[PDB]
Amino acid sequence: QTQQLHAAMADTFLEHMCRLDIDSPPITARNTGIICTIGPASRSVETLKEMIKSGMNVARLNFSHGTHEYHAETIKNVRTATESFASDPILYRPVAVALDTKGPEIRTGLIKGSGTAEVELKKGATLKITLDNAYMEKCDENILWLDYKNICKVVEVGSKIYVDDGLISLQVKQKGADFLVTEVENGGSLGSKKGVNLPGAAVDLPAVSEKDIQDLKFGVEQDVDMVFASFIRKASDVHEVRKVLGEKGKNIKIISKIENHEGVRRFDEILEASDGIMVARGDLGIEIPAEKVFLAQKMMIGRCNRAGKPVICATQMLESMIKKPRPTRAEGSDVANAVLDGADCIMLSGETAKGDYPLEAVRMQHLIAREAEAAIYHLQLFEELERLAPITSDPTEATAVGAVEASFKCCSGAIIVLTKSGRSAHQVARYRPRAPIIAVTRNPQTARQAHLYRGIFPVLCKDPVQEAWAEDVDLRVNFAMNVGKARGFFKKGDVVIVLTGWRPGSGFTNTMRVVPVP
Amino acid sequence: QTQQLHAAMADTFLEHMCRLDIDSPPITARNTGIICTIGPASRSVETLKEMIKSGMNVARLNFSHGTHEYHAETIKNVRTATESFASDPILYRPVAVALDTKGPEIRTGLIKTAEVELKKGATLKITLDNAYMEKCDENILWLDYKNICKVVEVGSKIYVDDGLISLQVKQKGADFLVTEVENGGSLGSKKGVNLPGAAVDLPAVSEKDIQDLKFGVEQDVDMVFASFIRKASDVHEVRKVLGEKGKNIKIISKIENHEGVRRFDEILEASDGIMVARGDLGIEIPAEKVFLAQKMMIGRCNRAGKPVICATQMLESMIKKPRPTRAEGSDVANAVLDGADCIMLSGETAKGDYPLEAVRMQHLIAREAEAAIYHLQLFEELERLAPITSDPTEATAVGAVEASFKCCSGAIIVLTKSGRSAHQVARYRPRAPIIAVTRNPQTARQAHLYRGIFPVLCKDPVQEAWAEDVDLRVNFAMNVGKARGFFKKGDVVIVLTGWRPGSGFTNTMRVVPVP
Amino acid sequence: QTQQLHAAMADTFLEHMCRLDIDSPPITARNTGIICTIGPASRSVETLKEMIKSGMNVARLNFSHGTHEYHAETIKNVRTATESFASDPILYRPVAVALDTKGPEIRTGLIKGSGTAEVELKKGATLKITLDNAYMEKCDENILWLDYKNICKVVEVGSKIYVDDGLISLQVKQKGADFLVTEVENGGSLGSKKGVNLPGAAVDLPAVSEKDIQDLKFGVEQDVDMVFASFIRKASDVHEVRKVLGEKGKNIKIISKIENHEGVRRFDEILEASDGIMVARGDLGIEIPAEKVFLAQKMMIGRCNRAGKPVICATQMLESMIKKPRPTRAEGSDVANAVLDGADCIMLSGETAKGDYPLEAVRMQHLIAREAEAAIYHLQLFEELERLAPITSDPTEATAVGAVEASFKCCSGAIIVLTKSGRSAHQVARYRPRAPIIAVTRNPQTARQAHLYRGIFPVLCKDPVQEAWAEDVDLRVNFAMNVGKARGFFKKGDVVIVLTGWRPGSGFTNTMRVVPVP
Numbered sequence A, C: 001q002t003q004q005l006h007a008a009m010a011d012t013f014l015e016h017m018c019r020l021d022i023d024s025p026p027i028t029a030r031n032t033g034i035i036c037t038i039g040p041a042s043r044s045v046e047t048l049k050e051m052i053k054s055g056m057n058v059a060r061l062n063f064s065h066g067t068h069e070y071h072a073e074t075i076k077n078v079r080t081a082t083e084s085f086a087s088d089p090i091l092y093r094p095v096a097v098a099l100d101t102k103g104p105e106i107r108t109g110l111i112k113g114s115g116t117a118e119v120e121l122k123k124g125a126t127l128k129i130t131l132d133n134a135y136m137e138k139c140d141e142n143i144l145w146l147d148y149k150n151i152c153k154v155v156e157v158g159s160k161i162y163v164d165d166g167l168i169s170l171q172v173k174q175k176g177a178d179f180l181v182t183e184v185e186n187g188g189s190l191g192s193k194k195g196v197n198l199p200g201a202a203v204d205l206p207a208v209s210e211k212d213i214q215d216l217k218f219g220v221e222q223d224v225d226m227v228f229a230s231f232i233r234k235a236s237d238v239h240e241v242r243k244v245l246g247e248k249g250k251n252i253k254i255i256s257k258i259e260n261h262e263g264v265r266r267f268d269e270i271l272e273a274s275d276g277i278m279v280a281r282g283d284l285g286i287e288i289p290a291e292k293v294f295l296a297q298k299m300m301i302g303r304c305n306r307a308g309k310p311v312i313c314a315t316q317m318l319e320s321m322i323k324k325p326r327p328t329r330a331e332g333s334d335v336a337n338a339v340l341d342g343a344d345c346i347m348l349s350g351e352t353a354k355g356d357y358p359l360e361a362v363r364m365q366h367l368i369a370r371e372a373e374a375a376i377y378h379l380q381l382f383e384e385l386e387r388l389a390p391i392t393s394d395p396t397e398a399t400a401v402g403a404v405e406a407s408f409k410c411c412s413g414a415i416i417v418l419t420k421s422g423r424s425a426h427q428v429a430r431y432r433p434r435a436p437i438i439a440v441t442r443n444p445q446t447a448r449q450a451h452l453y454r455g456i457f458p459v460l461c462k463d464p465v466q467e468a469w470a471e472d473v474d475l476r477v478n479f480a481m482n483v484g485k486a487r488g489f490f491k492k493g494d495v496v497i498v499l500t501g502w503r504p505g506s507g508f509t510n511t512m513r514v515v516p517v518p
Numbered sequence B: 001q002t003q004q005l006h007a008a009m010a011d012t013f014l015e016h017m018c019r020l021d022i023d024s025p026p027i028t029a030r031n032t033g034i035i036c037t038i039g040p041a042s043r044s045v046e047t048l049k050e051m052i053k054s055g056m057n058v059a060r061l062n063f064s065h066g067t068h069e070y071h072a073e074t075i076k077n078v079r080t081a082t083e084s085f086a087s088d089p090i091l092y093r094p095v096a097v098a099l100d101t102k103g104p105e106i107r108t109g110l111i112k113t114a115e116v117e118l119k120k121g122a123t124l125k126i127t128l129d130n131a132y133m134e135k136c137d138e139n140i141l142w143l144d145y146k147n148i149c150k151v152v153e154v155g156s157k158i159y160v161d162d163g164l165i166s167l168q169v170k171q172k173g174a175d176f177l178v179t180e181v182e183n184g185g186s187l188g189s190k191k192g193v194n195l196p197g198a199a200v201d202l203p204a205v206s207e208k209d210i211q212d213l214k215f216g217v218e219q220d221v222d223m224v225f226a227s228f229i230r231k232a233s234d235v236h237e238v239r240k241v242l243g244e245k246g247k248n249i250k251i252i253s254k255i256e257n258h259e260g261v262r263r264f265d266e267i268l269e270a271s272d273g274i275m276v277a278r279g280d281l282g283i284e285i286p287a288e289k290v291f292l293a294q295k296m297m298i299g300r301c302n303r304a305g306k307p308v309i310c311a312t313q314m315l316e317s318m319i320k321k322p323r324p325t326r327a328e329g330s331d332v333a334n335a336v337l338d339g340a341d342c343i344m345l346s347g348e349t350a351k352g353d354y355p356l357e358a359v360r361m362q363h364l365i366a367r368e369a370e371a372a373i374y375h376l377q378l379f380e381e382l383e384r385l386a387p388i389t390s391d392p393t394e395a396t397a398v399g400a401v402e403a404s405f406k407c408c409s410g411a412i413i414v415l416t417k418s419g420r421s422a423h424q425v426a427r428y429r430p431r432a433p434i435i436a437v438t439r440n441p442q443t444a445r446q447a448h449l450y451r452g453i454f455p456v457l458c459k460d461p462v463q464e465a466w467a468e469d470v471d472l473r474v475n476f477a478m479n480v481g482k483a484r485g486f487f488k489k490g491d492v493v494i495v496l497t498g499w500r501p502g503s504g505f506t507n508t509m510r511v512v513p514v515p
Ligand SMILES: O=P(O)(O)OC[C@H]1O[C@](O)(COP(=O)(O)O)[C@@H](O)[C@@H]1O
Pocket: A418, A419, A420, A421, A422, A423, A424, A425, A469, A472, A473, A499, A500, A501, A502, A503, A504, A505, A506, A507, A508, A509
């Protein structure tokens, strides 16, 4: 009568839905990664500590805004808050840092005069668009400037142009070279520097601009753990980002953001080149008809799970929590269905960057992820992941799937794995056990990147190596036991699964033990 | 393209069938146990060595016939043939000895070693005057069941000689029944008699049975096949007689009548395994219903995780000819597909002209059939029907089998003192052979009852360091597998072990390359 | 608690097996066809009448033996027996006649002396096989003649040779021209004119010999319904057979007998070209290792089920009943499992052609089939057959599959179908309903050939055509009900499914009705 174990026993999906209970409380452990965007509301040290206690795993910096120096000062504070807890290495939480590139964004110019100044637009009214730099800080209700110099080559008559994140639409009546005349189809106020999207068009900007180059190089300087590459359209876009990171950034992980039609059409070659995927729903839902977005979301998450690569669901998950302390019912549903669909991580944007309730937002996500994890139908999920996954002779693969079937058989409080690269923990997570995966590593980077995988609770063993390998192994296992008790995941005399290798070095995980908690 | 691995991939049973292929060769290992009835044809030491090499696992002695001195000698020969292979521990094969009780049979009398001949429509009086107990003929017939006249009615049907001859009852009384013959045939001496519609109140454990089970205990048999078990208390009666001294002897109940079928669930619970006794069962219930009973029992046994044995007329034509009929081919293969742990030969090995050919042919067929099982479905069914547990050992067993499928392992190697750890694995029915390494030679002989368990008996003395004693026995298993052709250097096997000595602590699963 | 209805309710195959109950009695209807081979024991009119009441649906004539005059008299008798029941059109049962060809057999010659003579062959003995026609009637223990002139070309030292249904095995020790020297391996006594098999060998005998041609012409003259073509090795073999049947016998059904390695290897092209398949296990279990036959059986059955074509299981199903009035447990089990495998028809050979208990064997097949039909796991079968079925716009297909599902939901007593060609009845049977399919037709050939499909109970309407079509339809629907009532398939108030088209002529079946029985 807990963890939805009654519904876990159903022999159909529908009987499984029918058995779900609001009075079956979940376990302590939460498997889904939380990712928070840091900005004015959340960049203070004091508050960042509170985000970490609340459940933040990764901190994301949007490089569509702000300066290398401002960002460097966010990071510094994230690292200070994080290390504030190394005091007790048993309760320490590694906290990753991710870099979100500008990429091929299209923006409007400044509104003439005051900073905040917006101009009201009205349906049917007229708007001329120019590329004349005279006008770039002189935008208003008749004339508007755009930073995409080649716009006219690619937008025809009939075309639609959305501005301010889908909320203002315009139609292309007449067009020269230099300028476009438009009729306003949906009005509203327009401020300075707003996102422009061109649904019909083949936008021809480079995947990595010189601005992107400098930003990527800065992130290599700063030892960030991952990069969220914007607007990826094809594999070669991914490789180009991989080259700009080069040898020095070779361990930093690349998440292609999919946020347009081409990204979606060529998803297979992009996923093959990337380390993970983000479903970038804001842009994506302007670049395609908003009603189609749920399908791309489910296509991308499914294929990532089929391929054992992390997928993040993003944007407007709890929008209303920017202004209010509780979410709407669609927001509640949406976070929960992201987890149920299969998402490894879930992202907060404005809600933590600039909102009036960043901590509450983090908590709500933590609370909902945990309910929805219990609600997942593991029976079917696990069987469908066994079937699709190929056959191999890799003993770690066999050991990984054995540990998972065993975790179901005995309702183990956790599956513990020792791992240098993380790779042995990733092989377990791909099969989606209910129980949490406590990944014990010495490598601080592996610990931080581990958060991209559903279920991995990384822990960082700071202790020196023993002279006897067998003793060193057992000390790490036992470290995972102490973390699990201290966290409430399990208590003494509960059974856990433990994974280890037949010899030192990566790639040898082959041993699975069913072990009582000491 | 080997082991029907193509068929094993399919999404449906029907596509699985379509992908079955006569040119996909089976692995060398054979998982289904073979039991052979020993008799005039096969009781010599010379013939028994060859039966073992051809794949016999359990020697059955039928106590419906023979004297204790006779069976004691049979055993002595089996133990001799078996021990002749201890020369090389790596190739030694444990052989079990099983005792199969007479039970409450009914038999005819002697004849006036000659045979009279009943014709359809003819008249036959049946009698209980013991003066006639050694002169039966076309007219008069003696049976040794004294209450026969109390339980029969006007019209009831009597089958004689394993169902070949049949009589109907035209008039009753006491001492006499008058019967019309319905199926003619050549009656002989002391033949089986069956009274389908009737409830026979003979003891389950008769005076003779009691002395025969004692023989079992003294002779040190491994298991007992108790005939005509009708209800759970019959099995308790048997367990009692075996008593304290006989308590590690497994009791396999033989279902051969309508009541045993009906009270199957309770008999299963009390028994350590089941034998589907198709000979008698197929006269006591209509022959067309046997396959239903058989599949019901194999099914409930696989569900309970207890061994079940298919028996009787599996290769009947091979008593006289050296190839079986096509039916006989089919039937053996379907018993394995149904889920039988063991298959059995009777007359084929006891008294036929081709005992070794019959054993070989069970070995070949079982090996083909085990590769044609749709494990995808079978494993998911057994895994699901399994109640969740706290036992680390169940978890470890299921983890092992899951891993044996993901990497198509050459075997699952298990150390076990009592057998129990190997049994847990075999309940889930891996494709891969389970090589169970033990020092207890009784554990090794009984382990044949379970599908896929190839017991190996370790004769090495105990190393003083426990980890080294564990490795040695793992390596021994490896050498057995290499030598028998189950696998070779660099293949993967699963290895299952515990974290300390003593029963009940198996908790460790390793995926290991063969050295 | 009848028809194994408790077992039909189970969620898994394994639970389905567990609930099979020997006290859950079957319905009256038997769905699997029974094909009896005719010969001395069964060819009297008196005996044939009773074969028919006992359940023979098809009369099989084995052309490997006997003259045209003798077979003509057999057919005459088949039809006298059959037509003896036409007095009562309600109880009248179409009985088909099938011709089984000789084909490329290899046969020995005559034993010297007595026509009835045998010789002993003893393990270790030398036996010489000659082609010199001198010896064709002087065969004995030292010298054996056979009728395949090219045998020496196709065998080598080491080869095996089986004689008389695999009883006797020889091993070639030397290969001359015009002879072989062999060692007897399995001895046994040998009589005259016995079949020879060469497992190793690329036998080259012609698909359709001069004698097969005489024979097929004769079948066309006698208006047989189906041909069983022996030793089909490839599609062109089937074509060759079709030519000889030509126009006069274009609608005569060709069932390819698979009895050798090449047939099995090329099964798909043979299947496509044929109207049906027989698994001829006698020859097959000598041409391939005996332990592999059950594989071939199940491959062929599954593939014919998948394609919707009749498949017959044949040979030694009840062999002991040639001498004993009750079958062995393996035989009882073999038959059940052929039905459970998915076979449309099961066949009897010596059991009915020369044995002592022809009626009893026919009755046993009836009884076992009826039990085994109930024990089928229809939930899974029907789900998979629907699943595998290619998708079609064909209204008749959609109607068939709706009728089958409807028959399941209301546990109907029959599926009544009107059909000219048989086709619409076949499309129901391919989906494998529990309920018997009663096919009403005015076409006597259609009736006789429907016996090759599991479930079809053909009924032959002799009444003339009503002027008003709608009444002509009702009249045949109503003749089906009378047949069902009289046979005890159902009774007044039971529901049945009735299938019709929207106009006369073949191909228009599109109407399913759920109908209480008056
Ligand atoms: O996940 P990875 O990178 O393969 O790391 C797993 C490795 O960790 C170990 O358990 C311990 O190795 P170290 O002692 O070198 O950390 C190995 O046995 C195993 O092969």
